[PDB]
């Protein structure tokens, strides 16, 4: 459409802040908190960025669970299909990460979608990454569960082109 983003689509400070605005009821709150921390930890290991949880909408990355139309004009679609979406770094809505609350959120081996894997993917965008055409990359646009390490060369290559 006609919407444009502001800026070069990467962060220009090293301490990225995030706000968990709400929760899926599917997992305990602390388990969700840790799943997000673990997803952020994948990227903090390979970049000069730190990720700091804050408690207001002042945050660079605002995390929200939503159903259907949830405030940004890009509605979720109910069970399955679209699982989450994320906006590239920048001001305002930029940087944000939303998860479809109509999904059953699980962690590995759970019968639903892995919150950990989905968050790792979404946060990739929230740091500036596009989709990959490499099927085994984390940034591949289609969810496939796996227990093996999520990051592949293509992902680290993308992130390093952004942050060094």
């Amino acid at each position: 459409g006609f919407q444009t983003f502001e800026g070069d689509l990467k962060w220009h400070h090293h301490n990225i802040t995030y706000w968990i605005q709400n929760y899926s009821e599917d997992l305990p709150r602390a388990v969700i908190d840790d799943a997000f921390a673990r997803a952020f930890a994948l990227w903090s290991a390979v970049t000069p960025l730190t990720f700091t949880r804050v408690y207001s909408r002042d945050a660079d990355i605002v995390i929200q669970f939503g159903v259907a139309e949830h405030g940004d004009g890009y509605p979720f679609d109910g069970k399955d299909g679209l699982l989450a979406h994320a906006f590239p770094p920048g001001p305002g809505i930029q940087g944000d990460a939303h998860f479809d609350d109509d999904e059953l959120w699980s962690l590995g081996k759970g019968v639903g979608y892995s919150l950990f894997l989905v968050a790792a993917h979404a946060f990739g965008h929230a740091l500036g990454l596009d989709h990959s055409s490499v099927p085994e990359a984390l940034m591949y646009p289609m969810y496939r569960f796996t227990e093996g390490p999520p990051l592949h060369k293509d992902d680290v290559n993308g992130i390093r082109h952004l942050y060094g």
């Binding site: 919407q3 679209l82 699982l83 906006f87 646009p141 289609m142």
Partner: peptide, 8 residues
């Protein structure tokens, strides 16, 4: 816009 992640 955002980029979306899709299931099978």
């Amino acid at each position: 816009x955002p980029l979306g992640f899709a299931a099978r």
